[PDB]
C-alpha cells in the first residue's frame, strides 16, 4: 500500500472528495516480510524523508536473544505464534510480536525488523 | 507549496523592525540564526536605516564585507544576519556601541553605550540539557550554548540570567530569577518595563507561568516569566532604556 494520507470517508459515512493530489511525503512503502533465510542475511537500505536512513531486513538468521540483560546471537530456526496473522506462521515471517523457535529455545520478538534491520528477542521462561 | 520561503514582502514583515512598509515591495528575509524573527532585525536594516551609514544596500554590503561592524565582538559579514534583543552592535572606527533592545511601542531600537558595557551580554538561560560526557548544556535565548559541569549545575537554572563576556565567552555574574530581582520585559503589553519581581504563579498544565513585577513608581503589573528578563539583583546594571 502506497498512500497513507487521509481516508475518503467521514465518520458520519459521507464521502470525501480530495481537494489536492497526493504528496510524496504522505506515501508509504512495500512492507518488509522478514522471513527466515537459509544463510546470507539479506537487507536493503531505504533513503527516507530528510535523507535519513532505514534498514529493512528481508531474510534474518540470528536473532539476538536476551535474558535479564544478557544477550547472544542464536541462529533463528523458525516462526511460531504470530498474533498478527496465521499466514505469517505458515510463510515463516517475523514481526515484533512473533515467537521464534531458536537455539536456546523460544523467544518473543521485541524489534521491528522492517525498520531497524535487526531481530531482537526475549527468552520465554517455562 | 513545494518548499521553503526565500523571500519576504515588506508588508508581511515583522511588526518590530521600523521598516517603511509601503515604499518598496521586498524586504530582507533574515537568515536563521541566533534569535527568532520575532526578536530580531537584519544587519542591513541596522547599517542602512537605523544608523544611516548607507543609503544603499551595495554600500552596506561593502561595509559589512570590509568588516567594520561587530555583533558581540565578532565580525558579521552577512547582511541577513539576525541582530536581537540585548545584542551589542559595535563600530570601532567610530567608537560607538549600541544595545539592541525593544521599545515600549514594541519595536527594536539601538540604545547607545560605551565599551565597558559593550563587552557584556546578558543571556537568559532558557533550558538545560544533559549531554554526553555527563556534562550540562545550557541552551540560551540567543540560541547559544554553554557547557558547564555537574558541580555548578545547581547554581545554573533555567530562567536565570548569565552575564557573558562575549568575544571570549566567559561567564561572570549569574543573576537568579527570584523575588526582588530586577527584571526587564521583552515582549507583550508591558514591553520595555522594568522593576523588581514580587510573585510567581504556576498554572498546572502547559499554561505558562506568570510573574508579578513592581516598577519604580510602585505600580504592580504581571507578565510572562519567559518574557521577564533578569538584568540585576536589585539594580538593572546594564543601562537599559
Amino acid at each position: 500500500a502506497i498512500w497513507q494520507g487521509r481516508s475518503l470517508k467521514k465518520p458520519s459515512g459521507g464521502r470525501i472528495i480530495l481537494a489536492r493530489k497526493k504528496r510524496k511525503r504522505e506515501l508509504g512503502r512495500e512492507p518488509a516480510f522478514t522471513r527466515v533465510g537459509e544463510e546470507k542475511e539479506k537487507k536493503k537500505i531505504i533513503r527516507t524523508y530528510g535523507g535519513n536512513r532505514k534498514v529493512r531486513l528481508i531474510e534474518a538468521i540470528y536473532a539476538n536473544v536476551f535474558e535479564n540483560g544478557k544477550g547472544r546471537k542464536v541462529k533463528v530456526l523458525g516462526v511460531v505464534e504470530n498474533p498478527a496473522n496465521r499466514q505469517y506462521v505458515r510463510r515463516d515471517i517475523i514481526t515484533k510480536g512473533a515467537i521464534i523457535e531458536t537455539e536456546a529455545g523460544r523467544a518473543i520478538v521485541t524489534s521491528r525488523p522492517g525498520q531497524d534491520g535487526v531481530v531482537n528477542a526475549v527468552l520465554i521462561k517455562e | 507549496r513545494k518548499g521553503a520561503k526565500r523571500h519576504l514582502k515588506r508588508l508581511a514583515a515583522p511588526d518590530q523592525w521600523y521598516i517603511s512598509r509601503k515604499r518598496y515591495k521586498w524586504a530582507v528575509r533574515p537568515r536563521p540564526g541566533p534569535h527568532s524573527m520575532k526578536t530580531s532585525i537584519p544587519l542591513l536594516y541596522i547599517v542602512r536605516d537605523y544608523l544611516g551609514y548607507a543609503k544603499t544596500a551595495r554600500e552596506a554590503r561593502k561595509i559589512l564585507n570590509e568588516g567594520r561592524i561587530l555583533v558581540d565582538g565578532r565580525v558579521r559579514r552577512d547582511y541577513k544576519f539576525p541582530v536581537g534583543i540585548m545584542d551589542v552592535v559595535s563600530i570601532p572606527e567610530t567608537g560607538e556601541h549600541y544595545r539592541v533592545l525593544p521599545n515600549r511601542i514594541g519595536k527594536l531600537v539601538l540604545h547607545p553605550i560605551s565599551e565597558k558595557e559593550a563587552n557584556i551580554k546578558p543571556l537568559r538561560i532558557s533550558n538545560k540539557r544533559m549531554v554526553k560526557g555527563a556534562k550540562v548544556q545550557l541552551n540560551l535565548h540567543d540560541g547559544s550554548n554553554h557547557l558547564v559541569t555537574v558541580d555548578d549545575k545547581d547554581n545554573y537554572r533555567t530562567a536565570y540570567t548569565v552575564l557573558m563576556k562575549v568575544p571570549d565567552r566567559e561567564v561572570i555574574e549569574i543573576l537568579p530569577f527570584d523575588v526582588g530581582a530586577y527584571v526587564f520585559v521583552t515582549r507583550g503589553k508591558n514591553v520595555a518595563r522594568k522593576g523588581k519581581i514580587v510573585e510567581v504563579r504556576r498554572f498546572p498544565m502547559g499554561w505558562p507561568d506568570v510573574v508579578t513585577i513592581e516598577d519604580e513608581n510602585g505600580e504592580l503589573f504581571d507578565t510572562l516569566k519567559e518574557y521577564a528578563f533578569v538584568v540585576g539583583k536589585e539594580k538593572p546594571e546594564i543601562s537599559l532604556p
Binding site: 481516508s7 465518520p11 | 498546572p204 498544565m205 502547559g206
Partner: protein, 111 residues
Amino acid sequence: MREIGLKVQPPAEKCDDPHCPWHGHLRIHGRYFEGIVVSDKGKKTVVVERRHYHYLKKYERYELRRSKVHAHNPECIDAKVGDRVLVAETRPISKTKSWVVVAVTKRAGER
C-alpha cells in the same frame, strides 16, 4: 504514583493499557474540560458531550450547541453513560479519538 499535570485524584487500581495516562505511557497536552458521557458501547471508547451557548449578533439571542468529542476510556476508569468525566487532549489514538478520560464524578441518577 505519578502526578499528571492537572491535579485530580488518580484511580484506585493500577493495571491498564499503554494508552492510559497514569499507568501507561500516554501523555496529555493542551486543553481539558468536563463533560457528560452519552455512549459507552465501544471498547475503551466513550462519547463525551459539551453544551455551550452561541450568541447571535443579529437576533441578540443565544442558541445551544452540542459538541461530542470521542474520548478513550481506560478500564481503570470505566466511565458509564451519565457520568461527569474529565477529558484531556492527547495524540491521536484512532480516526476519531484524540482525547482521553482521566477522572470521573459518577452519576447513577440523571434528569
